[PDB]
């Protein structure tokens, strides 16, 4: 019924060459079943963890997915989300300015 809002961002201000944590925050969605991958240059990152499922006052769900990463000049990072409300996976690129 409700499609996920998506924010992709780092836990700390990004500096190239300095390890950090890549977050994908998905919220405002329903039902709870959802697929979230973090991508490095288009490829799935293997060691991704997520928070315990919870929800807001309007009953919509939220989850944080995260993994360690090192921002660089050359690597592209992204979040890929699929959900019953999406005809195809939505990919949101990480931008260190947001």
């Amino acid at each position: 019924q409700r499609t996920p809002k998506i924010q992709v961002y780092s836990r700390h201000p990004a500096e190239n060459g300095k390890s950090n944590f890549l977050n994908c925050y998905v919220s405002g969605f329903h039902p709870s079943d959802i697929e979230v991958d973090l991508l490095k240059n288009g490829e799935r990152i293997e060691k991704v963890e997520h928070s315990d499922l919870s929800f807001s006052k309007d009953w919509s769900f939220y989850l944080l997915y995260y993994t360690e990463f090192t921002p660089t000049e050359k690597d592209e990072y992204a979040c890929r989300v699929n959900h019953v409300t999406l005809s195809q996976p939505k990919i949101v690129k990480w931008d260190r300015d947001m």
Binding site: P31, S32, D52, L53, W59, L64, M98
Partner: protein, 275 residues
Amino acid sequence: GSHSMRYFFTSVSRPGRGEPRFIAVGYVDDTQFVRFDSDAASQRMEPRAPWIEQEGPEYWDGETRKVKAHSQTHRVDLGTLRGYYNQSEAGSHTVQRMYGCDVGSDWRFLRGYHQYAYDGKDYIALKEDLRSWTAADMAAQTTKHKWEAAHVAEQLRAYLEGTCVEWLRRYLENGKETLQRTDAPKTHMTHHAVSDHEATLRCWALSFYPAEITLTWQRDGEDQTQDTELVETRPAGDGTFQKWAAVVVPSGQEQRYTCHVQHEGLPKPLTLRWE
């Protein structure tokens, strides 16, 4: 300041095989402190904050037993609701429940709540009087008559005004080093040219706790909402939160714009201007 304890329960039916997925989480303010996940190996309520780990075996056994009982209650409910709504056994459905209590600065009871949803919509909720029920439709009305006959509100009221507030106070004491500490937003402003005569100013608030915050832009000392963007407050992943607000401005006019930051951890609101 004020404080709350809240528990959140989600059950999702799995028509193809097996029992519903069941996940429960408990929070004090914006800090998760326990969880139960039916998919996890322990099959126990588990700690998620240092200050709860000191609770003894009787605590953990009791919490585990009760949360498992919640899981079975929801399993039955999913069956009951499927019948109420005349639905197929083939589809997946969701039950959600949330309850908790708020206390004031003096740690006295402020308010309690207990609400229940089916498939993401209000189903039944305890009113603020902790005596009455809001049933959203006729299935929920059926439930409301059942819960009246079973003295359900009396039991919830006793919990919300008693056990809920008593243990909240206990937790606030045991976890005081973090639960009663506010982390003020670390703030800064970035500048991003959008053309050779227009630029985005982005006002950042980072690493703050609790999550409640207000970010506002002013131009020449009057609030501005046109050409602004405010993102939803988001978890940093380390227990703190982040937020930013941005505005597009004509280049060279940056000094007209001030970002104002209000947060419990700030005695007086902060004002930021572009460097």
